[PDB]
Amino acid sequence: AMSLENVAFNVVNKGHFDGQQGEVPVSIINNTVYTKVDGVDVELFENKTTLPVNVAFELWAKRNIKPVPEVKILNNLGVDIAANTVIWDYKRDAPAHISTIGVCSMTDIAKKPTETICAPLTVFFDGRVDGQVDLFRNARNGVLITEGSVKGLQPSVGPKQASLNGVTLIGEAVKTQFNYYKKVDGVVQQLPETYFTQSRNLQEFKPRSQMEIDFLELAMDEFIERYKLEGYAFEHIVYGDFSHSQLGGLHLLIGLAKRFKESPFELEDFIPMDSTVKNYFITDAQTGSSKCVCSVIDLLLDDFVEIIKSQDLSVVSKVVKVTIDYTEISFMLWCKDGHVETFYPKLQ
Amino acid sequence: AMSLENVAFNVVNKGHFDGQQGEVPVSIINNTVYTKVDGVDVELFENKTTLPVNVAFELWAKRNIKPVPEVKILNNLGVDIAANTVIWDYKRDAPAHISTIGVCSMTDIAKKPTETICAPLTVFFDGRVDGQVDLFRNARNGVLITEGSVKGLQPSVGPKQASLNGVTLIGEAVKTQFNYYKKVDGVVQQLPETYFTQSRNLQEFKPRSQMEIDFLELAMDEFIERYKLEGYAFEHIVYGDFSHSQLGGLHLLIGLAKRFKESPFELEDFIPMDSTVKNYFITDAQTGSSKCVCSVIDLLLDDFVEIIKSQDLSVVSKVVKVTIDYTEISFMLWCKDGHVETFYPKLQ
Amino acid sequence: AMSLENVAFNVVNKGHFDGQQGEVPVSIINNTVYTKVDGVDVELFENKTTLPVNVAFELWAKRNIKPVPEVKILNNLGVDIAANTVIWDYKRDAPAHISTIGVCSMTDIAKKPTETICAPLTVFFDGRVDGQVDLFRNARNGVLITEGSVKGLQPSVGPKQASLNGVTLIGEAVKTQFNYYKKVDGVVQQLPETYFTQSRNLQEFKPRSQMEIDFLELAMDEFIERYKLEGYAFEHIVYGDFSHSQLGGLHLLIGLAKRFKESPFELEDFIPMDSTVKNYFITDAQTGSSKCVCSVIDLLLDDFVEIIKSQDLSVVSKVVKVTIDYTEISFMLWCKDGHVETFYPKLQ
Amino acid sequence: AMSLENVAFNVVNKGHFDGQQGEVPVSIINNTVYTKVDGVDVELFENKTTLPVNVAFELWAKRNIKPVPEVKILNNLGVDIAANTVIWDYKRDAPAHISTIGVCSMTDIAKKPTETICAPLTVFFDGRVDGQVDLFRNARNGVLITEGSVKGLQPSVGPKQASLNGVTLIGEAVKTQFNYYKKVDGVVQQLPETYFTQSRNLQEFKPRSQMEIDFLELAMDEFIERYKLEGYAFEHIVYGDFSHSQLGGLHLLIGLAKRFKESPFELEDFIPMDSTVKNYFITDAQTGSSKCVCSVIDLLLDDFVEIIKSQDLSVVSKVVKVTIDYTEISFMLWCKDGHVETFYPKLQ
Amino acid sequence: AMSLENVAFNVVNKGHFDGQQGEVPVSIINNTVYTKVDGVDVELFENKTTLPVNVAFELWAKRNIKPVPEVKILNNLGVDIAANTVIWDYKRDAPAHISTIGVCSMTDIAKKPTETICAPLTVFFDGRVDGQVDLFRNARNGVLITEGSVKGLQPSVGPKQASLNGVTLIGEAVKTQFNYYKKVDGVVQQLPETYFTQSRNLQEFKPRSQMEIDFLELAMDEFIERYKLEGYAFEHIVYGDFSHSQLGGLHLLIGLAKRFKESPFELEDFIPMDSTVKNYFITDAQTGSSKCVCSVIDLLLDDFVEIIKSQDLSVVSKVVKVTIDYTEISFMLWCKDGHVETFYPKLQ
Ligand SMILES: CC(C)Sc1ccccc1NC(N)=O
Ligand SMILES: CC(C)Sc1ccccc1NC(N)=O
Q: For site (Transition state stabilizer), what residue positions does UniProt give (chains A, B, C, D, E)?
């Protein structure tokens, strides 16, 4: 007996949808859900989605409150829908997927992922929920996460971090590192060997290795000397070149974080969605150096050093394909006389 | 267990709120309520009120579907709220009253009209509903309607017509003529002697007397001769004067109806609400004669003839107060040499 | 090179989308599309759909402007989507189907109905469009309409009428009677023997048989005598009983049309969508007789007489299933002592 | 002569409504009020209320710009409306009360609080405004604040802090500590002995005692040793337990502030309104420990220590009622073998 | 071939409008532009302007991405429109000017500034764009910026800083100091000798002189002693007086910045637009000292000291006119016995 008033009751009393019985009076005005408290209207939800306000309110109330894979991972793995849950995209303030399975009558395409409509779609399955490993086994298409071993299924160790209520974290009180599994056309697909993005913020950037501590602490030339990085264009790629009107390089998050300590800058997120490679319209405030499309990736500096040092530097220009977050990221490698000139996540 | 989904279920299955159990999926987009049927969205309600869309939808679903007094009568009698019903104002496409009693949790000021918040308000009571005549006995302020006699109470015979789902009609299969009772501060009132407006439409105007049949059939001068109306300015007041840029007179609905048969005209209802006297910005299409504020009353021609023939015609200008629909309507009477020049419902 | 400006250009110059090149300046304000003409904004489209304004504008511009099956037929035949066209639902002011095939980039699930996403869906195909009869041969699920014969396929003669730009008509200058074909899981179906609804309006109702001319012209008792209809409750079912507070019967459109000539009434279309059986909240203006859910079907009086005369009248109450517009309509038949009491399209 | 243009003139010239004469041109588009400056539209107000945009704009312009009691205090004291002022709720971006008295024609229920409509409502009176102490004396229901002694009226010393234009502060240049008085049904009610919440922010939390300085500075075990708090479950209640998936305790703001210095966390304010006890959906970012409904109170640590040390610890579970901000806050006290297990503001 | 889909394509691929060919699918819902990515809608633009959503989206995409004069300078110079560009007002999130020239078909008044409609308007010309110096020479009214000498044209050295994508900065990698030129009625107007505002933020305020370093570092009395400022009311004007209910002075940004280090305060920007003098409704959080209209100017402390020391202090009150950002700012100078009492940017 699902209702707007019951969803609102659950939100008010339980902080989210928790299957409790009860109703609270609700006002819907424009794209906002209100509830009367002390005689006045109090905002419960503001619809930032393209779904109707009451539908979006229900999916947001029914969001997964356990640590879940970051939306960029689900996207990279081709996830279309989730089995009996809502993966909430906190970066977009909207559901990560168009439709639902057993969640809300307005968005539901099926009540159970066993229905034939779900066969062609890659359904997300959560091994932490009873019966979902078996539903993945029977699903034609799907992505499954588990906390442990599934008999006969070859696992892929996922990233250390997961999203818990919009907070990307490496769990200490909860497990955030999952085993990943994927099926395409009934066949269990082998997940490729991959690097993982670190999912760090520029404002609260923390180094996660001795090389990362040395990059942030040391001067440019003594870090490049210490790590034998001469001829790898780190001055351009990682540190950034702010001497000309067009900002040079600056494709690693750690480089933006080092710069951020000294001087601020504006990063325009013109396609605001979680992705392995992010594109920003950057304006350096100290110099006025800017670039409309500056691709940024948050790789551990050690991982980036390993990628660039594993490349053949004998050709003027070429595409270098690197598996990151299960997706193939194309990089553009430009060389001259055996040295790197630039290396950046290719603007497709 | 009131809900948006249950209200929508009732509307879809029962044509209105009927206390049935069940839920249908609903979409709220801007000011419109939709329901999914055959995979697509079907409009259930468009909010034309100042209330939130879901609140207005519920009060409209919970509207009184029995013949009820016309909103102009309830307003004239000082009705503030209704006991356990919604009087729907079909002319405003909104509830006739701000608040409710035992109808909707968002608009309710009380569950029963016996609550102290209702004592200062004139509560509308319906004798056709069990217990409401006795609820009117214990009510400090209120208006009661009945079909028959109430022991100890002297009735006031109301108008022949009532509103049934927005259709004003004189009932043949249902009773539409109610007895009216009013209480002010615990005291049963003596409702005044009153005329009633006929509530007719211009498009479907029907005469309700031999004088009204003679007005519509006969030529102007032979009707005025037949009914001894010489010197009462009917040529101006009732027939209308379309010879000058400013339209002269035309204050009785029957006169507009006679004109409407020959030539059309535009009536701009600039304050669209039910009222004893209506104000229109009229433009005669045949002549181009117009008037910004043309007060129109629908009185039975016999009643209007009685009112104008009962006036002293010896003063240039004066206010003539007439009880119509239980309210005091001020008229402006203009005379010259013992004859009427004009007589119109005063524009204040 | 599809664009908002190009769609608007086509609408302004061609009256609809016609694949012409060009752009006109457009304003989008709330749910309305405007274009500048003579320096001022002129309304091109008002979005009455649950789709975004520009998406709905494009599907409405791309609507099928040929006589097409009425949405109720497509719905009854299980049509999910149309192949490379938009069937516009003029009763809902919205697209008849959720998604499109080769029409609009925002709503498209495929460019051609041969794509695997379309195999589980019943795709509507139009033989009048080149290649669509052969696309229906290779389609797993679909409904085909043709004007003439298809080799190897046994036709189902559809209704005489079709919808041309929202006008339901029996074509004289165009063909409106199509042959219908349906395929379910690669298998050509044998469409059932069916009656068709006549799709007439109450305001412009025209008789389509000598019995229908006699019903509208003759008095109740002499029509019932002429056609030997005594004991079939036509007085109740077809003519209507307006003597009690609850309106009795009145389930055939011809009966509402006969009543409409004498007195008007209000029909509240509370679920406004095309369907074989329509449900109205009716209020008779002459008597005040009313009914919340009055099911109305527009059957040819001869067809209705044949259905009721082909029933066993020996049981108090039972469900009578009749194929109308290819769907199974349940009727409720109430009898007493071998005569009909009522017979109405069952309210479920 | 109140007007939209006059309100806008006052806002533009005086920073708020100041009774000045004049008009500025205004644009209303959707829920925003604009004014033309340098040829372009400049935003004056964005309506975040459920009132119409122009009505909300006027009440916001007419807001009380003097230090006023925090909305949680007014709510706890049962305040329904204010006498000739608008108490603006800066946390909700809306008026603290539904209706007004002598402020705005659209929201006014009366021009003066002496009108009979105000008798049943608890009217807020401000002794700093001439004649309001006398209006409280004559009011059937009311809450009065004063800066000093009122002859014969027994005062209640309120909190040290008040809200000045949305800034909660302890006044140095203005008085923020008021004497409070309350009347119910004509009778001056004795205000209970109460604790007060400190109204601090987590980001700018400042200790207000030597115990509070010692809690923030000292290690958990040496603070518990210094203040003889062994067996009072401060490790759970105040410090918080982040070792399990469900976050343990953490019900005092000072505890959240101590944690905030080391690691960040997300506090979801699912009912965003000022209240003595706040409920948050917390997610600790360092550990991933979370709780859907974590009740938090900002009590001075000395006051909380006094409350918990004044309880009988001989029963497994019981409700402990404590007057805080004039309201009775129920706490749940759980004990085992004479020691505290948990003590939290009860989730009603 | 301008289109919504092409603008969106440019934004998605190039970070702004860059004249590239291509189309991306777009959704318009309410005042937001979305694009489908990974099956879901991603927000491209939220309309905060009074223009239609698609029109505002196009002007924002077509915004000038080079360092441009701050909107306050353009306003002070009487700029009405820009030649073939959009000056984006990042403080208002809207175009700085009502109309465009050669930018967007919906807002364009002309394709080239040579059209007679542009003759009466002051058109902004950018010498960095080919042919714009010549268009200024031929324009009846205009403001021109250049990076160097224009033969025969007497230059005005503008401010050191310019706005680059909403970031006010003094360019190191780009030129931000322009030569300014103005024409009124065909005649090149001499720009006056002017002071410039520093355009600093309170949160990130940096001193730009030894006097400014000494003001922020030194105690009030020793700074006033060091710079011989006794009798110039700096204690009131620059430091601020927070001892009374009405906040005294505080008209220089550096003074607000010094206060901000010790205690926070609320600055209500009631007319949110870039201007030489800003008006704030300030509330000091430490003391509760407040002022509805506190005029604040960001002048270099040396420049302010020079202005106040160049005034005759022998009259009680007078208007002191100072050219700042090319506009004449009126100041109110109040003196007593040869000393300053107050000096503030006059509240007009
Ligand atoms: C008490 C009866 C003899 S009179 C009565 C009957 C029905 C309704 C009302 C009233 N009178 C009243 N004052 O409430
Ligand atoms: C193959 C033909 C003899 S039969 C045919 C002709 C036209 C449309 C459809 C079908 N049959 C089908 N199963 O698709």
A: 291
